[model samples]
Target: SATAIATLLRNHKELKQRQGLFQAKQTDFFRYKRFVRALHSEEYANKSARQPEIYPTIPSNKIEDQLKSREIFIQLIKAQMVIPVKKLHSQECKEHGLKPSKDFPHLIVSNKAQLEADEYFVWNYNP
Candidate 1:
């Protein structure tokens, strides 16, 4: 039940804080602009953006039921929601021998490339 879920979330302190974080990220001018631009170029997805397949319609007739519903609601709300961050710069890419491919304009790289980049940075930073 949308109402049931809403009521639970409305009174949930941690859930409210997480919701605020997401809203704050989207509301910030620069962050919002970057996110919009990434939506155009990035291949990322917000895992928690989708609504649940089935709504919890069972009335909270028992304390256990209410607690169970609230727990599931919190889990669903916290599902893989994340804020987008900027991609590595061209200079950084060059240092790592990672040229942005024309085919993958969004800067998606191969697993091998990613591993090499990680190892390069790790080895360099260690010294």
Candidate 2:
């Protein structure tokens, strides 16, 4: 029983990693689509813009995965999802009297961005 249980746990972890990555890619696709819609809302095109075909293809290697994530980051920037630190800070400060601290500069902003990129890559490449 113990052997079976252990094997189950191990297998679960493996699939968990894979499925989690897959789900994240799905989420990114949704976000990317939203980004494109925003780009075309005003007749910059007759219909919604689409990312380059290169944008959504799953990567074949870790390096390619990394590059894909970077590409998404760029698209998000173009979409204006990523905001300036000063703007965010000012909004927060006005609402809550927040103040700058040396300990947490725009805390975890880059980390969040990096993780989004990482997830895109991880789903494409092997663990």
Candidate 3:
């Protein structure tokens, strides 16, 4: 039962170069804003007036269950419950081009667009 959560968490860092990813991924959404600001300050040389989330984003305020890691997303995939509204993608979409379209979104690891690195099924658990 819990393995589904563990599977996604474990395989989350499939990106090969993967140097900066470990430290960055180990954080909570609360700290991530600070982390993003730090990157913006350094990368933009303090020029970024507005902070932007560069990946799959969570709202600053979330429901009680969402306060923890990946549980809802686990349900989201396990039950095949997707928000039919639209789509979005990626650790860094700019790097990999794995943007979340209607065809390929959060659940599946996709194809050649992974031009920079790779992500595969490895069967990330299911209901």
Candidate 4:
């Protein structure tokens, strides 16, 4: 939830700072501004700026449910696979002289092993 909101704030980092200047002493104003800013951007949505949200929708409950120790363990595994497919989609598109399209933004990784394989093959995975 905070991550999503933070992404929105990041997308409009300059705007937030400028708006905050008008209400420095008002803690409520700062909080409200951040919340409203998140609403305006909905950064994580595939197409948000084009379509603003109606409310401050967040996944705090869902995140909390998954933050449980065992759930986190599962998330770690899922992220591993997600990383690989993402890399393949990105690297392959670039190498093929194609601009990766946002319509199919995701690369499908089957498992953590695939993710690891991509990382290893990339040589400069971190690079």
Instruction: Give the candidate number with the greatest TM-score.
Output: 2
lDDT of 3 by residue, 29-58 (tens): 112222223222333222222332212333
RMSDs, each prediction? 17.0, 17.5, 17.3, 17.3
Candidates' TM-scores?
A: 0.22, 0.28, 0.17, 0.20
Model 4 scores a C-alpha lDDT of: 0.30
Which of the two, 2 or 4, has more TM-score? 2
Tens-place lDDT per residue, model 4, 15-68, is 242111111111111122232333334353333434335213333365452333
| Better model by TM-score: candidate 1 vs candidate 3 | 1
Runs in model 4 deviating more than 4 A are 11-15, 19-31, 42-127
For candidate 3, the TM-score is 0.17
Task: Report the candidate with higher TM-score, 1 versus 2.
Answer: 2
> What lDDT score belongs to each candidate, Candidate 1 first?
0.28, 0.31, 0.28, 0.30
> Residue pairs in steric clash, candidate 2?
none
TM-score of 4: 0.20
lDDT of 2 at 1: 22
Q: After superposition, how far is residue 20 of candidate 1 from its true place, in Å?
A: 5.9
